[PDB]
Amino acid sequence: SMSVKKPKRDDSKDLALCSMILTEMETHEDAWPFLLPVNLKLVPGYKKVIKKPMDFSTIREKLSSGQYPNLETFALDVRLVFDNCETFNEDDSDIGRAGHNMRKYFEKKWTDTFK
């Protein structure tokens, strides 16, 4: 509360470390469904159904331009990518499986780096 603070957690490396995680996600072999924004002209249903589209290139540009105020807003956008993927894609599809694999991969790197 006012004039009463928990001890200061060192956040000075968060930007670098989120960039490293994002590089690892970008280079994963199963990243191909997520590298670029879904083409809203060419994919029926996407625009209407997926209220907040997100992809790795969009996260990379937000990261690079100071649009994440803290590491939690970064994790929220990463998870959005996988939540969108589960909304639109069957579990038993190449894309559906890619999204589960990547979410697992991310969540381990997240825990190992920050928790």
Tell me the domain boundaries of the chain: 1-115
φ, ψ for residue 112, nearest 5 deg: -60, -35
19 CB-contact burial (10 Å; exposed 0-12 / middle 13-18 / buried 19+) = middle
Task: Please choose, from the candidates 39, 52, 112, 113, the residue with its C-alpha nearest in 3D space to the C-alpha of residue 81.
Answer: 52
Tokens (6 digits) for 77: 């956008």
Tokens (6 digits) for 97: 């499986």
Q: Max alpha carbon distance in the chain (Å)? A: 54
**CATH number at 1-115:** 1.20.920.10
Tokens (6 digits) for 33: 């469904």
Q: What is the 3-state secondary structure (H, E, C) of 85-114?
A: HHHHCCCCCHHHHHHHHHHHHHHHHHHHHH
Contact 98, 32 (CB under 8 A): yes
The conformational region for residue 66 under phi > 0 = left, psi -120 to 50 = alpha, else beta, is left
Contact 54, 80 (CB under 8 A): yes
Q: Cα separation of 100 and 86, whole Å? A: 8
> Within 10 Å of residue 49's Cβ, how many Cβ atoms?
11
Q: Cα separation of 33 and 98, whole Å? A: 8
DSSP character for 65?
T
Q: Cα separation of 5 and 108, whole Å? A: 30
Q: What kind of experiment solved this structure?
A: X-ray
Under DSSP, is residue 36 helix (H, G, I), strand (E, B) or coil? coil
This structure's resolution (angstroms)?
Answer: 1.7
Secondary structure percentages of the chain, helix, strand, coil, to 5: 60, 0, 40
